[PDB]
From a paper:
Canonical Notch signalling involves a simple cascade, whereby ligand binding induces successive cleavages to release the Notch intracellular domain (NICD) which translocates to the nucleus and directly regulates gene expression with its binding partners (Kovall, 2008; Kovall & Blacklow, 2010; Bray, 2016; Kovall et al, 2017). All Notch ligands have a similar architecture, with an extracellular domain consisting of multiple (7, 8, or 16) epidermal growth factor (EGF) repeats, a so‐called Delta/Serrate/Lag‐2 (DSL) domain and a highly conserved N‐terminal region (Bray, 2006; D’Souza et al, 2008; Kopan & Ilagan, 2009; Kovall & Blacklow, 2010).
Notable exceptions to the overall conserved arrangements are the β1‐2 and β5‐6 loops which exhibit different lengths and folding in the ligands. These highly variable loops protrude apically from the C2 domain core and are positioned far from the Notch‐binding interface. In comparison, the variant with the loop deletion, the DeltaΔβ1‐2 fragment, retained Notch binding as predicted from the fact that the loop is positioned far away from the Notch‐binding interface. A deletion mutation affecting one of these, a loop between the β1 and β2 strands of the C2 domain core, was sufficient to compromise liposome binding.
Residue numbers in the entry: 23 to 100, 106 to 258
Write the structure that this text describes.
């Protein structure tokens, strides 16, 4: 029943700097001002319900996903390393139409000779708005003092799930137990020449006494009756 997909595209940070202005590696050079060491960037994505108080201490009701080190400084996210893009937060209820989202870009060292790593928060963004179920991506781009993160987000229903909250189930069928498709809200729209609850009954031709339907618009005659309509 539906899923919220957040697809990260590009994180920009050519200077390898921090939320507080300093550099992630912590060492520059005397002249100029550029730094040395780059910024090993991970991400944390928290999706929660719209709770109308814009607070960050509440629980991530949908998910609290942590990303491995994807790149250094500026990163082109639009691969693997165990990470899936887009990130999917599934649900089993009606989509509430509203949501709250936290996305953090983090620095994190990764030297195999250390028993403890060094982490620095690079950027934090909050997205809390009303979102409708649609196959179109909504693209945004958050820009801080040094860093920029571009992403797409949307909610789409799972397979065989129609409706506005992705709750009404419907599967097309074309066998002895039904011949039909589904509409936009999830109603069983039947193929031409079918009828009934699941539309397992064919529709014969104009007339047909004694004759019956094995397939739509046809009539099989019984003993003692000929013609087209099996009169
Ligand atoms: C911190 O560093 C860790 C080590 O990385 C090293 O450091 C730097 C210098 C890198 O440039 C790199 O070159 C170094 O190796 C790093 O650990 C790595 O973590 C990832 C995910 O957390 C692991 O990925 C998994 O890999 C296997 C297969 O990988 C093979 O190929 C690679 C190269 O292509 C080799 O390096 C490996 O040794 C293997 O030979 C995948 O199969 C697996 O996907 C599976 O996911 C689930 C299981 O969880 C299954 O259900 C799926 O079906 C898949 O089978 C992952 O993609 C990677 O192995 C690991 N490296 C090593 C050496 O163990 C870590 O990510 C860095 N960051 C953090 C935050 O820790
Ligand atoms: C890198 O991202 C840009 C979008 O900013 C895209 O045009 C390009 O295709 C990406 N790189 C590759 C190798 O596709
Ligand atoms: C991007 O930022 C917020 C949504 O996070 C919204 O107020 C703004 O209008 C968005 N702009 C575009 C062009 O999507």
């Amino acid at each position: 029943s539906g899923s919220f997909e957040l697809r990260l595209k590009y994180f920009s940070n050519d200077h390898g700097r921090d939320n507080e202005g300093r550099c992630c590696s912590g060492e520059s050079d005397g002249a100029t001002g550029k730094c040395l060491g780059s910024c090993k960037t991970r991400f944390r994505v928290c999706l929660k319900h719209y709770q109308a108080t814009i607070d960050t201490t509440s629980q991530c009701t949908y998910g609290d996903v942590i990303t491995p080190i994807l790149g250094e400084n500026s990163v082109n996210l639009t691969q693997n390393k165990g990470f899936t893009n887009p990130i999917q937060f599934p649900f089993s209820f009606s989509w509430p139409g509203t949501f709250s989202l936290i996305v953090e870009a983090w620095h994190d060292t990764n030297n195999s000779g250390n028993a403890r790593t060094n982490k620095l928060l690079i950027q934090r963004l909050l997205v809390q708005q009303v979102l409708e179920v649609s196959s179109e991506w909504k693209t945004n781009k958050s820009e801080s003092q040094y860093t920029s993160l571009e992403y797409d987000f949307r909610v789409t229903c799972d397979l065989n799930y129609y409706g506005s909250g992705c709750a009404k189930f419907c599967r097309p069928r074309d066998d002895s137990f039904g011949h039909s498709t589904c509409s936009e809200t999830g109603e069983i729209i039947c193929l031409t020449g079918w009828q009934g609850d699941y539309c397992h009954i064919p529709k014969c031709a104009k007339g047909c006494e004694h004759g019956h339907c094995d397939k739509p618009n046809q009539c099989v005659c019984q003993l003692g009756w000929k013609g087209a309509l099996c009169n």
